[PDB]
Amino acid sequence: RPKTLFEPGEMVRVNDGPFADFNGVVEEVDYEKSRLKVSVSIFGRATPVELDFSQVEKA
Numbered sequence: 001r002p003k004t005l006f007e008p009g010e011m012v013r014v015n016d017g018p019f020a021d022f023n024g025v026v027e028e029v030d031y032e033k034s035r036l037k038v039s040v041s042i043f044g045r046a047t048p049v050e051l052d053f054s055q056v057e058k059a
Contacts, residue, residue, distance in 0.1 A: 002053070002054075002057045002058055003058045004053050004058075005058070006026050006029055006036055006053070006058060007026070007029065008026060008027060008028065008029065009025060009026075009027075010025060010026050010058070010059070011023055011024065011025050011059035012024060012025070012026055012036060012038045012051070012056040012057065012058060012059055013056055013057040013058070013059050014038075014040060014051055014055065014056045015055070015056070015057060016051070016054075016055040016056075017051075017055065019040050019042075019047070019049055019051065022040040022041075022042070023040070023041075023059055024038040024039050024040040024041065024046070024047075025038060025039070026038040027039065027048065030050075034052065034053070035050045035051070035052065036050065036051055036052070036053065036056060037050055038050075038051055038056065
């Protein structure tokens, strides 16, 4: 029962696509476009990617 309440600075979880099994924070959110702006710490660098609410889980 994942929550759809996400806010800037909130950590999220990715379980779909190559970013699956990775966590990150949502710097920007887009309820109108139904997309969350969260980056994944890959290679030691943040990777700001857009994931859907179902594509990622609230942390």
